[PDB]
Amino acid sequence: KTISFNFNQFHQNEEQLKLQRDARISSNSVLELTKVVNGVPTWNSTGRALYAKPVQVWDSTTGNVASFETRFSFSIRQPFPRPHPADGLVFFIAPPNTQTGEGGGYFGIYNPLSPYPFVAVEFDTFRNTWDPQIPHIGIDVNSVISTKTVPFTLDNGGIANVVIKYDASTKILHVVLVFPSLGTIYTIADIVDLKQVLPESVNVGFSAATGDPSGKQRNATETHDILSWSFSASLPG
């Protein structure tokens, strides 16, 4: 069939969402993935938002795979330039009913203990041992070690428009990152076989994380706000 939803803004206690950990909805409508107290982002924070109902990316009966397009706007404000903001946010697809994973450079989607598959598009702002310079957009498959990455300069506190598109017939997952205020455009694409790494039904959502305590740096933090979000998927048959 063909599912599709769309939030032009968020309402406190959104029946259509599942907030986890530090994820909250501010009074003025934005989805704050990581904690921010009195206008200031704190470290040691991790949160995710999933769409309440599961979506079917493929049908084992027909063998068909769904194509999808999702658009969202986010904003990352980095109050403390030194020594290094962290960690970033990601959009991900995962099995339904998963639980927040490790924080820090794992964005809360990777769980070393009990690893579950996931396809995610990351917006990394802190350089871990496995990362190339930052910030960078990355395409992750079952691992936080991106298959493809591309650098980008962040518009601190500005608005970012993202477009993620998946064409099943070509298996191409292409993402676009635009900062309207700077007129800058960033693009990245890679081949991904959803049918090969994910179950027929999945959850889609966001996950973010601020500096991990082990880094011993309270400054290692930033905001991870989601302003709007629309999703559309087509599974012929």
Ligand X SMILES: OC[C@H]1O[C@H](O[C@H]2[C@@H](O)[C@@H](CO)O[C@@H](O[C@H]3[C@H](O)[C@@H](O)[C@@H](O)O[C@@H]3CO)[C@@H]2O)[C@H](O)[C@@H](O)[C@H]1O
Ligand Y SMILES: *[C@@H]1O[C@H](CO)[C@@H](O[C@@H]2O[C@H](CO)[C@@H](O)[C@H](O)[C@H]2NC(C)=O)[C@H](O[C@@H]2O[C@@H](C)[C@@H](O)[C@@H](O)[C@@H]2O)[C@H]1NC(C)=O
Ligand Z SMILES: *[C@@H]1O[C@H](CO)[C@@H](O[C@H]2O[C@H](CO)[C@@H](O)[C@H](O)[C@H]2NC(C)=O)[C@H](O[C@@H]2O[C@@H](C)[C@@H](O)[C@@H](O)[C@@H]2O)[C@H]1NC(C)=O
Query: Which of 20, 44, 125, 207 is in the footprint of ligand Y by CB under 6 A?
Result: 44
Residue spans of beta strands (DSSP E) within the chain: 2-7, 17-21, 24-25, 31-32, 36-37, 40-41, 46-51, 55-56, 67-75, 87-94, 119-124, 136-141, 148-151, 160-167, 172-179, 184-191, 201-210, 225-234
Q: Does 115 bind ligand Z (CB under 6 A)?
A: no
Shortest distance in whole angstroms from residue 165 CB to Mn ion: 19
> Between the CA atoms of 166, 95, 229 and 112, what dihedral angle is there, to the nearest 10 degrees?
-100
Shortest distance in whole angstroms from residue 93 CB to its own copies: 18
d(CA 147, CA 141) in angstroms, rounded, equals 7
Chain contacts with Mn ion (rule: CB under 5 A): 124, 131, 138
d(CA 58, CA 212) in angstroms, rounded, equals 36
Closest by alpha carbon to 92, among 202, 170, 235, 209? 202
Shortest distance in whole angstroms from residue 93 CB to ligand X: 22
Are 204 and 55 contacting, i.e. CB atoms less than 8 angstroms apart? yes
Q: Give residues 69-88 in contact with ligand X (rule: CB under 6 A).
A: 86-87
Q: Does 41 bind ligand X (CB under 6 A)?
A: no
* Residue 131 partner contact from ligand Z, its own copies, Mn ion, none using kind-dependent CB cut-offs of 5 to 8 Å: Mn ion
d(CA 171, CA 191) in angstroms, rounded, equals 5
Q: Give residues 104-133 in contact with ligand Y (rule: CB under 6 A).
A: none
Query: Which of 56, 75, 128, 161 is in the footprint of its own copies by CB under 8 A?
Result: 161
Q: Does 145 bind its own copies (CB under 8 A)?
A: no
d(CA 62, CA 211) in angstroms, rounded, equals 44
* Residue 44 partner contact from ligand Y, ligand X, its own copies, none using kind-dependent CB cut-offs of 5 to 8 Å: ligand Y
By beta-carbon distance, which residue lies closest to ligand X?
215
End-to-end CA distance of the chain: 6
Upper half-sphere CA count for residue 216 (Cβ side, 13 Å) = 0
Q: Does 98 bind ligand Z (CB under 6 A)?
A: no
* Residue 87 partner contact from ligand Y, its own copies, ligand X, none using kind-dependent CB cut-offs of 5 to 8 Å: ligand X
Q: Does 40 bind ligand Y (CB under 6 A)?
A: no
Shortest distance in whole angstroms from residue 147 CB to its own copies: 10
What residues make contact with its own copies under the rule CB under 8 A?
A: 71, 148, 161, 163, 165, 167, 170, 172, 174, 176, 178, 180, 183, 185, 187, 189-191
